[PDB]
Each structure stands twice: as C-alpha cells, then as structure tokens.
Amino acid sequence: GSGTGCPPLPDDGIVFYEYYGYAGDRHTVGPVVTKDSSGNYPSPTHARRRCRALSQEADPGEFVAICYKSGTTGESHWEYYKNIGKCPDP
C-alpha cells in the first residue's frame, strides 16, 4: 500500500470498526465502502466501535473517530475525539 490515507480500520481484538457513508447526517448508515490499507481510499467515513468483550446488541454503536480527505495534501486520516468513554474489559 504505502499510501496510508484512510485505512479500513484494523481489528485489534478489543474492538473493530465499520465503514459507513456519511451523508450530511450523523449516525446514518450509508453505502459501505470497499478496499483495505493496500488501497488507501479517502472517505469522509464514520467508524463504529464495539467492544468484542461486549455483545453487539449491548452496544448501539458509538462513533470514536471520523475520516476526512484533506483538500490541501489530498491525504485522508482518522480524527480522535476527546472525552471518549470506556467499556468493560471482561
């Protein structure tokens, strides 16, 4: 890849992320995007995180980071939000 940009968001065994098409409205499930880190596709994408230790139905999916393609550099990156919460380890 060597393009970084907006990666598919890897699985780390604690959480996972999903890619949604942000369309002028939050929390809205848009069309799913394709390609991986060896693709580097920039999208104003919303990631939903769930804790593997927690059941999918327990979490209503909360967004912890957003992606945005930069008009100046042309690259895309994930933005970490402040005041984030924590889920139980076990």
Automatic annotation (TrEMBL):
Cysteines paired by S-S bonds: 6-67, 51-87
Name of the protein in its database record: Transforming growth factor mimic
Organism expressing this protein natively: Heligmosomoides polygyrus bakeri
Full protein segment contained here: 177 to 262 of 422
